[model samples]
Target: SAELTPILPFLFLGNEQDAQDLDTMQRLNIGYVINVTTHLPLYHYEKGLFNYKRLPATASNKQNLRQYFEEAFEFIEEAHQCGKGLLIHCQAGVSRSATIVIAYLMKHTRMTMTDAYKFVKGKRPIISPNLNFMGQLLEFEEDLNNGVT
Candidate 1:
């Protein structure tokens, strides 16, 4: 009974529990996963299971989470390329993880921050990234030249 929310048909976001559950991963056909917290369990050690990226990040305001945007997006893109599912997770499946998903939407789908966040929140109502996270998305949107103030 772990939590999982879809960002794209092949992309998902969840909490520690979902990521830690083998059956959940199996059911979702998770070929890749991004773990955003250091304290969580690492499942990638089980060889041939999935492509996993464990990037330590805090839910705090000072954690420059955006630094991993490109890598994270690229990883997800790779999973999609192979027709596999990808899951991104933080402590609560609420903030930092959601920000990553939004950035992917903005970059991959060419959506502005407004559209990306709105679409994301609609899928998972609990997603509420910190102001700093939002700032990063806004800058990313501008960088992509999506054009919105």
Candidate 2:
């Protein structure tokens, strides 16, 4: 393992380096991978060994994030049901990736934006989603509150 940050029993959040590190994935038994970096080249893994999803957005691309929330959430949920771990990563793993994880927590757990941020921050102290993502998360919180999902 390469010291990846574990966000939950079934979830892990980390950087591009961590995502690319095969040893870490094997150690954690990570079967699902979420790549949040927009322009990064996709990494390879054994075809039957890993399930992958790419959201393809940066922190500044706020408007596009909301559209991917449900799909991302469903991916995470499916991975869990299959008894597999999930690894979510972006360029830095601090903004774009963290934002997606926070949004997942908010949508799937019915957590408020503040609570979701705190929960993720508590697990991975270095996480800091960008302002635009934060604003979009607030909007997501409102949508969840209004039963829009």
Candidate 3:
């Protein structure tokens, strides 16, 4: 019922409402759902082909999204490798979810923060990681560099 933006071949991004619609997931071939929203109602459908992973975080910079990077990125990487669709969604599909996806791109593709931002933003124009999240992203960028870049 809503627009689901494809970030990569097996990766899609959208708002929380989009995650609640099973029909939409079927239509898009989404095999997995990643919930990053703080308070969006969780999907109620229990019997379906899709899997769900909830990593709740607020829109505040203080929320350490990096703490979840390993598990989240591993799920995304596995889905992409297996050619299964994964939907990453938050409340507005802007800050929280976008931040995680950007970090994934950086990790998996060996891209810098700017390159990741440009790549994801090129697909979804409305993505704006908040100042706090942005700060954490910078830290993520540094961590990726291993104190060398």
Candidate 4:
């Protein structure tokens, strides 16, 4: 039973990478990775089963946040369809990961910004969405969804 628990989906927002991070995933039996980092070697390698997708952090560029969210949503949806849990990580999972996931919750689950943040953080414990990202998510909704965002 212990080995059957799916790898807990983590929305990593921090930039710091260490042995603990790798160890945590190994212990949890991670099978999929959604890296949203802007670091040079964009892709992480896994022996065979683990799959990693690279998404450059674009939230820092306000002008590109929309495209970033859209891409993230599409990517996450794809992972969901693959029947696997996902982990979204960036320099600091706060702004980038939170924003994308929040937008995704709204887009797919019809969750409000407040509700989405609360839901994710309730699980991840440190899901502090950046204030600017919060504002951007709201704006993204309005502009892209005809005032519904």
Candidate 5:
């Protein structure tokens, strides 16, 4: 656990460029990237970035969302283990990326989605995941509650 200490509190963004803006992350020891966009265009834009991982962009598919979140959890956990901070992102980092990160925090930190959103927003004021994605997340909670697995 101590190995992952400095690598956590991973940054979440709607898109990769947001992470790119803070170019110092790579310089300051950033070693992992978590791309959560379904748009192929964005994926291509991520081509030259170092230590980037491209995850499919999530939509309203809650069933698939569970699987995606599970994978993301593993990705972040691995980054943590290697003392690498993961930058979780989608197009806006507000909806898609937030959905996945909130799920991880809930599973790992026991933090509620509302609280998590507020926390992320506190740091990155532009962090707005999109209303449609928010609706999908609500459905995800419902399905998860109903044992959709």
Candidate 6:
């Protein structure tokens, strides 16, 4: 679906509207929904249909979003364990949420920050994480490089 862009076999990145619609999630068999933003309310249709996580943070270069890296991968791993797709989203699907997806890719695989950014960009061309977010990911890449995964 155009509303959601696939980042992996079990991962997608998109905007709040995409998550709110739920059709793309349901259509793609997505069970875990990760929302990274300050104030976007979740739209849970039923009790057990989907799992939602709110990794609250503002879309700003000053925000210390490195704090969410561990938890983000935790949730992504959970989705992978259950064989269900996961969606990472933010207000515009451009900054905060993109960082989580990029960092997840870097941590789980050997992809460098540059390679990971290119991979995500190939699918969602609009993603442009803030400079600070990029810095955090660079550090994350170093951690992965040191076998910290």
Report the poorest 10 consecutive residues by lDDT, candidate 1. 140-149
Per-residue lDDT of model 1, residues 1-149, tens digit only = 33589788899999877777787787888899999887787765566688889878865668898789888988998999999999899888889889999988888898878999999899889889998888888788887894442
Using TM-score, give the best candidate's number. Answer: 6
Worst 10 residues of 3 by lDDT: 37-46
| TM-score: the better of candidates 3 and 6 | 6
Clash number for candidate 5: 10
Q: Write the per-residue lDDT of candidate 3 for residues 57-83, one digit (tens) a residue.
A: 875547888788888988887787777
Error of 4 at 144 (Å): 5.9
lDDT of 2 by residue, 1-149 (tens): 23577877888998888887877787887889998867875576554568889887854543467778787888898889988899988877788778888988887777888988999888788888767778889888887889886
Could you give candidate 6's per-residue lDDT for residues 1-149 as a string of tens digits?
34578889899898877887766678888999998876887777465688888898975558988898889899999999999999889888888889998888887876889999999999899889988888888888877778764
lDDT of 5 by residue, 64-140 (tens): 55457777788788877887667666655556676677666655775566765666566556566666556655665
Off by over 4 Å in 3: 59-61, 147-149
Residue 129 of model 5, lDDT score: 60
Tens-digit lDDT track of model 4 for 21-69: 5666666545566666666243346345456667676545453455677
What lDDT would candidate 6 get against the real structure? 0.85
- In candidate 2 the C-alpha lDDT for residue 42 amounts to 59
Note the Cα lDDT for every prediction shown: 0.85, 0.81, 0.83, 0.58, 0.59, 0.85
Worst window of 10 by summed lDDT in candidate 6: 38-47
Model 6 TM: 0.91
Query: Candidate 5 regions off by >4 Å?
Result: 1-8, 12-14, 19-23, 40-50, 58-64, 139-149
